[PDB]
Amino acid sequence: TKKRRNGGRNKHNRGHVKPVRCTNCARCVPKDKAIKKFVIRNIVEAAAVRDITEASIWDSYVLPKLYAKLHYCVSCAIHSKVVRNRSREARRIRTPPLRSFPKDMAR
Amino acid sequence: MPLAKDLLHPLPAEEKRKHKLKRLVQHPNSYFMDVKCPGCYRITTVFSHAQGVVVCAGCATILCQPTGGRAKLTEGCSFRRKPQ
């Protein structure tokens, strides 16, 4: 049976939409059927940051951030546990939650 | 609401809102401009959603410009909306 009203995602008024490549897997999965992670990361862990701001000649030199987007195969995002096996009533929730912590995945 | 039953006589600001077509009797949202352009005061009668530019006898410049909906007069058009 039809497990989702979305199916993948967002395939309405398109017919067929472009694919991207997975990161860990290097698949060719649709752009919309894709776990996407716009990952912002500090370059220097923010725990070895005091070693680096010692060597900063300038005004302690506020650190640049790393920017990427993690297009994921579905079978290779469950495997890396970005997403997991929700309950059938928890399946329906999309926007909640942010609601966790300060800045995650950095650490 | 099982009793919107004054379809016979709705409140005239409600049907003012509705549409030109969706109401009980279709009716235009338009009118006619008896304009008095102060360059020369010969009165020309135009349509509001004009479907045509217009000249005058003396001040024959443009007097009206096309748009999507209501055609915009050229800011020196001392008009008065009237059924005369």
Partner: protein, 129 residues
């Protein structure tokens, strides 16, 4: 497109009484369908309706009680003689106590009780009970 006005103003009645509204707007009132409601008006089922006269096709704002159960149309308009008028009351109407199948006989638009005494036959125009 509208291959019946009589279907697009009798389901529009029937869909608005199962929700229990007190007034239905029908469109666009062929004089076939006015004399269909006039059959239903004089048997109690329909209030005194109002015909808004815009000069395109017409609109009616029909009052109603709530006694109606299923007031539909038969299509296509099968020509029914008098001897096979009861094969269309048996399998259609709930019991022979009440209900009507409306006919367009050669004289006018009438139900199946007035036609079987006046001895007229015609086409089936719809039904209500």
């Amino acid at each position: 497109v509208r291959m019946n006005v009589l279907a697009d103003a009798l389901k529009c009645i029937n869909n608005a009484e199962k929700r229990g509204k007190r007034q239905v707007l029908l469109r666009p009132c062929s004089k076939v369908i006015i004399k269909f409601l006039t059959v239903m008006m004089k048997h109690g089922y329909i209030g005194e309706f109002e015909i808004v006269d815009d000069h395109r096709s017409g609109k009616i704002v029909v009052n109603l009680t709530g006694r109606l159960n299923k007031c539909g149309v038969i299509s296509p308009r099968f020509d029914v003689p008098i001897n096979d008028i009861e094969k269309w009351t048996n399998n259609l109407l709930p019991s022979r106590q009440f209900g009507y199948v409306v006919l367009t006989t050669s004289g006018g638009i009438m139900d199946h009780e007035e036609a079987r005494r006046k001895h007229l036959g015609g086409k089936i125009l719809g039904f209500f009970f």
